[PDB]
Design an enzyme around this catalytic site. Structure first.
Site, short mmCIF file in Angstrom:
data_model
loop_
_atom_site.label_atom_id
_atom_site.label_comp_id
_atom_site.label_asym_id
_atom_site.label_seq_id
_atom_site.Cartn_x
_atom_site.Cartn_y
_atom_site.Cartn_z
CG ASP A 38 -94.13 45.47 44.15
OD1 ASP A 38 -93.64 46.26 44.43
OD2 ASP A 38 -94.10 44.51 43.28
CG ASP A 222 -94.39 48.22 40.36
OD1 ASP A 222 -95.08 47.60 41.20
OD2 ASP A 222 -93.28 48.13 40.05
C1 LIG Z 1 -90.63 51.17 47.38
C2 LIG Z 1 -90.59 52.24 46.60
N1 LIG Z 1 -90.06 52.03 45.24
C3 LIG Z 1 -88.74 52.60 44.91
O1 LIG Z 1 -88.09 53.37 45.29
C4 LIG Z 1 -88.36 51.98 43.31
C5 LIG Z 1 -88.87 50.63 42.98
C6 LIG Z 1 -88.64 50.44 41.78
C7 LIG Z 1 -88.94 48.86 41.44
N2 LIG Z 1 -88.35 48.09 40.44
N3 LIG Z 1 -89.11 47.00 40.39
C8 LIG Z 1 -89.98 47.11 41.49
C9 LIG Z 1 -90.96 46.10 42.12
C10 LIG Z 1 -91.53 45.25 41.07
N4 LIG Z 1 -91.96 47.19 42.50
C11 LIG Z 1 -90.31 45.45 43.32
C12 LIG Z 1 -89.52 46.46 44.49
C13 LIG Z 1 -90.27 46.81 45.45
C14 LIG Z 1 -89.57 47.64 46.50
C15 LIG Z 1 -88.25 48.09 46.33
C16 LIG Z 1 -87.64 47.65 45.07
C17 LIG Z 1 -88.27 46.74 44.10
O2 LIG Z 1 -89.77 48.37 42.06
C18 LIG Z 1 -87.86 51.24 40.94
C19 LIG Z 1 -87.61 52.62 41.23
N5 LIG Z 1 -87.26 53.44 39.92
C20 LIG Z 1 -86.20 53.02 39.34
S1 LIG Z 1 -88.08 55.06 39.90
C21 LIG Z 1 -86.93 56.19 41.03
O3 LIG Z 1 -89.29 55.01 40.64
O4 LIG Z 1 -87.91 55.33 38.42
C22 LIG Z 1 -88.09 52.94 42.37
C23 LIG Z 1 -91.67 53.07 46.64
C24 LIG Z 1 -93.12 52.54 46.24
C25 LIG Z 1 -94.11 53.50 46.12
C26 LIG Z 1 -93.78 54.80 46.68
F1 LIG Z 1 -95.16 55.53 46.64
C27 LIG Z 1 -92.80 55.29 47.01
C28 LIG Z 1 -91.55 54.63 47.10
#
Ligand SMILES: C[C@@H](NC(=O)c1cc(-c2nnc([C@](C)(N)Cc3ccccc3)o2)cc(N(C)S(C)(=O)=O)c1)c1ccc(F)cc1
Length: 379
Positions: A38, A222
């Site tokens: 991440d 991200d």
């Molecule tokens: C794992 C997963 N992430 C999500 O499903 C997701 C996380 C955040 C999202 N917000 N903030 C983050 C952080 C800072 N990255 C922390 C985090 C990591 C994992 C889960 C939740 C939160 O991710 C925001 C969203 N959205 C609102 S969206 C639909 O994409 O517009 C989705 C993911 C990551 C890479 C990939 F190839 C496929 C799926």
């Protein structure tokens, strides 16, 4: 062409569209867990108590080297949140650098909408800077610890291969992961990996918005976010332009909002009817920029098959954000991305594994002349 970093190649996996993770081993004796890579956060945290979506978790009582920091931590994201206890322990990455460091680790005991069912990852590796670390910037992030305790170069690179695997090269760059040249954009500030978008095009057509709108609030990279998220005004304009460019076939309004999916017969997806999207990023020389171009294969994502059927369902993966632009997996999956922390820059190159067809391919091109790029950043 060669590869001294060969053992780190293919060290990432994913349960198809739910997060790319790398194996990390913590404690003594060894406790290996799947950890989400991440770049949008800065805390290293692992599930440390049973959870419906967790196959395994960190058991502190079994690690003789675990040290309790006697402080709790709460971390809320745009999506999900978790609470845990802070401590430190020995940490190694089996298919990463050949070192072992004592890093801060947050033991996750409770969470809400964070872990994802069937994703196969049990923790998260926050690779961003201390400025956004929780509880505060005094909690040294994992990569900071790695660089301070070892001689591993202050740089890492990511190759996320979507439809699931990829590579996270720690300490360097591997040439087998990309083709063409690497183009760098400055890391504007060291908190999130912030960058500056100076122009946006849909099938070569300029969206013609003041570049300040593209980074309104901020623009970050991200790996932990699925979509290419854009500020409201930019999102609306982009959707209108994408709709116009794909006039051959019409779709319901909800499709562009991610509220409706559209499925095609197996292997019939008419990628050709969707436009390519170009993001121009600030370069390393005055008034110079370059552009990264993605295909519908990146922004139209497959939805977990019903059960190996003859229908390919897709979700439009470009959505709106109230916290600035987020270049998630939609963007990263088309390129090999170099997080050159030592030189405060991020490099992009065409990925050796990005998904494309026989007519078009993701691209990284330059240089271009763009004036007043400094004014594009939000203050
Ligand atoms: C794992 C997963 N992430 C999500 O499903 C997701 C996380 C955040 C999202 N917000 N903030 C983050 C952080 C800072 N990255 C922390 C985090 C990591 C994992 C889960 C939740 C939160 O991710 C925001 C969203 N959205 C609102 S969206 C639909 O994409 O517009 C989705 C993911 C990551 C890479 C990939 F190839 C496929 C799926």
């Amino acid at each position: 062409r060669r590869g001294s970093f060969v053992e780190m190649v293919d060290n990432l996996r994913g349960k198809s569209g739910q997060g790319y993770y790398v194996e990390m081993t913590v404690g003594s004796p060894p406790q290996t867990l799947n950890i989400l890579v991440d770049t949008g956060s800065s805390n290293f945290a692992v599930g440390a108590a049973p959870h419906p979506f967790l196959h395994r978790y960190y058991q502190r009582q079994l690690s003789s080297t675990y040290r309790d920091l006697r402080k709790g931590v709460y971390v809320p994201y745009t999506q999900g949140a978790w609470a845990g206890e802070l401590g430190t322990d020995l940490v190694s990455i089996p298919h990463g650098p050949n070192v072992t460091v004592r890093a801060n680790i947050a033991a996750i005991t409770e969470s809400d909408k964070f872990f994802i069912n069937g994703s196969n990852w049990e923790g998260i590796l926050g690779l961003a800077y201390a400025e956004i670390a929780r509880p505060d910037d005094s909690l040294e992030p994992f990569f900071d610890s790695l660089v301070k305790q070892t001689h591993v170069p202050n740089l890492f690179s990511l190759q996320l291969c979507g439809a699931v695997g990829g590579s996270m090269i720690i300490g360097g760059i591997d040439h087998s992961l990309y083709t063409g040249s690497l183009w760098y954009t400055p890391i504007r500030r060291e908190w999130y990996y912030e960058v500056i978008i100076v122009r946006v095009e849909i099938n070569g057509q300029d969206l013609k918005m003041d570049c300040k709108e593209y980074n309104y609030d901020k623009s970050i990279v991200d790996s932990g976010t699925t979509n290419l998220r854009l500020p409201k005004k930019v999102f609306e304009a982009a959707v209108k332009s994408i709709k116009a460019a794909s006039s051959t076939e019409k779709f319901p309004d909800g499709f562009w909002l991610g509220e409706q999916l559209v499925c095609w017969q197996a292997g019939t997806t008419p990628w050709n009817i969707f436009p390519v999207i170009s993001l121009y990023l600030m370069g390393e020389v005055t008034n110079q920029s370059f552009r990264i171009t993605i295909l519908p294969q990146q922004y139209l994502r497959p939805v977990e098959d019903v059960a190996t059927s003859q229908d390919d369902c897709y979700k439009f993966a470009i959505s709106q954000s109230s916290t600035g632009t987020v270049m998630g997996a939609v963007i990263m999956e088309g390129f090999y991305v170099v997080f050159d922390r030592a030189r405060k820059r991020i490099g992009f190159a065409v990925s050796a594994c990005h998904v494309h067809d026989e007519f078009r391919t993701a691209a990284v091109e330059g240089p271009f002349v763009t004036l007043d790029m400094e004014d594009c950043g939000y203050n």
